[PDB]
DNA sequence: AGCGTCGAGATC
DNA sequence: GATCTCGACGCTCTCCC
């Protein structure tokens, strides 16, 4: 399926001289990322595209660069003002003419928009707008029919297209009323754009929406920039873990730690900030005057470093250059893992992604099952599939994570060399530096599985007493069926190896609730625990034992650019990255030129954006002119 | 009633 | 010195918009 539009590679194309004329010298960019020629050639033809790619894979271009290069304006879909904003101010500070419709723009100030499109003679190339303002607005209509008759309307881009899937974890009503776009508007082509990697989804968005036999462009989801990490939870001292790993990794770098609460949020928060960190807490419980302060502090960097956010409300804001992202807690399952973790370093940089596990957070997301009250069906038991396939990420300690998440999208070619060939961006498990040899322990396992049922005739025997009991500990609240066995095991082998007969369908668990809130998990057991006791299933487990002068410079110089962007942001009014992003700026302190004919060899940097922003930054640059060699 | 935490003492 | 064990003591949160 993740096909080759060799029709799409060639430069023989008629617009093929324009388009590269704006990418280089508009865009400033020098070198397409893999399907973004095919996918803008296609859309340049008048092709119906679907665009498939991870975070960070170059979604972007795929439209913003025709928009540029074609007889009228682009309207493009999407689902908050917030990422409208951030698109638009990226664009204007390439003095490309864009601007949008969201809502809370004044009808006055709505209207001078209006008039500069019905001139017929529109200098606008991009028109981002919500979906609720094409529905309830029936102004907006009237002014793209006259586009459209005039031939004016280039084409439709949806963003974030997933929304439109009720299986999508972003799902809005808005979006179901977009076929009706099409219907007033059959000549125009149709753009979608997802960074879901679910294929179930993927295959969704196509029926909903309607489109006609359109050209996929697929790629491979894995984060090429993200380092993974499942670390050990001692719960109560993850502010501390997170609090000492920031300060040691990313001291001056925004982030954001996920918790599942609102009420865990603000302790996270709170922990936080009294030790002397830039953090607060970002959830639905904040008075919108709250919200509003939050994003300004953080987005900007202006007084916040690190927002403590619940799953549901971090997903309303970003910015590119976040370095690390922490969770304080498990996840509901991979595919959402992979979404939240996912944001992190859109900019390109390399980014890490943290994950504080124990398997006691697993029974309490498992009450959180049973008692939410839509319906108890054998659909919310998918929701138990679901976080069992995340407890294996967790607890798989050897197998590579990126085949691991990619796995699980189902994604087949994924080249298990990429962390070998890649030591920058490993991930923990192929950071893991000795062996370990795996074992048959049927044996034990069968005397286990014999004493559970035992005792069982619901459960009686949580997980860490059956642990205490079989390492023949002095805390063992029994000690007769199996004491003293497991003697040969550590308290993290025999951990583990009974966290893997909870996996494998062999032990399941008791939801008993208690004298209070904090459910308790008894053991029992697994529906396959005959197909061993059968003499047929064989079991098996794996014990788990200086800066050189010139580089200090372009540190140096770095550190007052980024200040520049800073100022340059409060100045043109807007945020520091959409003057600069993070990797023009590193490779322009590396050069420490001031020569503009070397500085527009490099990625980012165009004649309008060195024209307007240069001055403050070649200053700067000057002083360094006696380094560069 | 289970469960981390954590100081004191065993063990390497 | 660093990791383990024991066992007394203290806290346990139907989440998210
Ligand atoms: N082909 C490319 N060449 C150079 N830089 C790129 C390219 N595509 C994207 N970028 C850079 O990557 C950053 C984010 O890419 P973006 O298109 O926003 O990814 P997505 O839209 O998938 O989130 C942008 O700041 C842009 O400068
Ligand atoms: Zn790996």
């Known amino acids: 399926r993740n096909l080759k539009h060799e029709r799409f590679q060639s430069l023989s194309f008629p617009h093929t001289k324009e388009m590269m004329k704006i990418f280089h ?49 682009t309207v493009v879909i999407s689902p908050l003002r917030s990422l ?14 864009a601007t949008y419709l969201t809502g809370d723009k004044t009808d006055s100030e709505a209207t001078n928009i209006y008039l500069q499109l019905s001139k017929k003679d529109p200098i606008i190339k991009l028109l981002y707008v919500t979906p609720e303002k094409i529905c309830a607005s029936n102004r907006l209509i009237s002014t793209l029919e006259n586009l459209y008759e005039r031939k004016l309307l280039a084409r439709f881009v949806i963003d974030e297209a997933h929304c439109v899937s009720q299986w999508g974890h972003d799902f809005r009503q808005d979006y179901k009323r977009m076929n009706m776009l099409r219907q007033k508007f059959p ?16 295959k969704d968005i196509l029926t909903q929406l309607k489109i006609l036999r359109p050209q996929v462009f697929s790629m491979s989801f894995n984060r090429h920039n993200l380092k993974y990490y499942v670390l050990p939870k001692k719960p109560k001292k993850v502010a501390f873990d997170c609090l000492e790993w920031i300060r040691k990794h990313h001291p001056y770098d925004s982030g954001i730690i996920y918790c599942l609460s609102r009420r865990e949020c603000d302790t996270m928060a709170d922990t936080l900030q009294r030790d002397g960190l830039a953090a607060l807490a970002y959830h639905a419980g904040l008075s919108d005057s709250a919200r509003d302060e939050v994003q300004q502090k953080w987005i900007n960097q202006d007084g916040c470093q690190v927002i403590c956010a619940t799953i549901a409300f971090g997903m309303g804001i970003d910015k590119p ?34 994950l504080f596990y124990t398997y006691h957070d697993v029974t309490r997301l498992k009450r959180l099952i049973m008692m939410e009250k839509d319906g108890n069906h054998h659909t919310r038991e998918t929701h138990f599939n679901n976080l069992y396939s995340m407890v294996h990420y967790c607890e798989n300690i050897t197998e590579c994570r990126r085949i ?20 920058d961006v490993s991930c923990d498990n192929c950071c893991k530096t000795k ?45 007769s069926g199996i004491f003293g066995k497991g003697s040969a095991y550590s308290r993290h082998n025999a951990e583990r190896l009974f966290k893997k007969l909870i996996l494998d369908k062999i032990l399941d668990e008791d939801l008993y609730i208690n004298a209070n809130d904090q459910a308790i998990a008894y053991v029992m057991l697994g529906n396959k625990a005959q197909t061993v006791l059968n003499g047929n299933l064989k079991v098996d487990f794996m014990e788990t034992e200086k800066v050189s ?60 954006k060195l024209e307007k922003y240069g001055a403050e ?4 640059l000057q002083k360094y002119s006696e380094w560069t060699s």
């Open 25 to 73: 010298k508009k865009f400033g960019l020098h070198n397409f990322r893999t399907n973004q020629l095919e996918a803008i050639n296609a859309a340049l033809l008048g092709e119906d595209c679907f665009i498939l790619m991870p975070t960070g894979g170059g979604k972007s271009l795929c439209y913003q660069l025709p928009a540029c290069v074609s007889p009228g304006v």
């Open 321 to 354: 250059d976040v370095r690390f992202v922490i969770h304080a807690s498990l996840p509901k399952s991979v595919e959402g893992y992979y979404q939240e973790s996912g944001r992190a370093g859109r900019d390109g940089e390399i980014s890490h992604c943290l």
């Open 549 to 608: 002068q010139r580089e200090e410079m372009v540190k140096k110089c770095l550190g007052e650019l980024t200040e520049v962007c800073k100022s340059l942001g409060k100045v043109f009014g807007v945020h520091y990255f959409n003057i600069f992003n993070t990797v023009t700026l590193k490779k322009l302190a590396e050069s420490l030129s001031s020569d503009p004919e070397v500085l527009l060899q490099i990625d980012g940097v165009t004649e309008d």
């Open 617 to 620: 930054v070649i200053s700067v």
């Open 404 to 423: 691991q998440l990619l796995a699980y999208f189902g994604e087949n070619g994924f080249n298990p060399d990429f962390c070998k060939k890649h030591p």
């Open 84 to 97: 409208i904003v951030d698109q638009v101010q990226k664009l204007t500070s390439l003095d490309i003419p």
């Open 187 to 202: 000549s125009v082509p149709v753009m979608a754009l997802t960074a879901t990697a679910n294929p179930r989804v993927q």
């Open 435 to 479: 062996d370990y040899k795996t074992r048959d322990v049927t044996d034990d396992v069968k005397s286990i599985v014999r004493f559970v049922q035992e005792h069982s005739s619901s459960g009686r025997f949580t997980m860490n007493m059956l642990v205490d009991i079989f390492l023949g500990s002095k805390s063992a609240k029994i000690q």
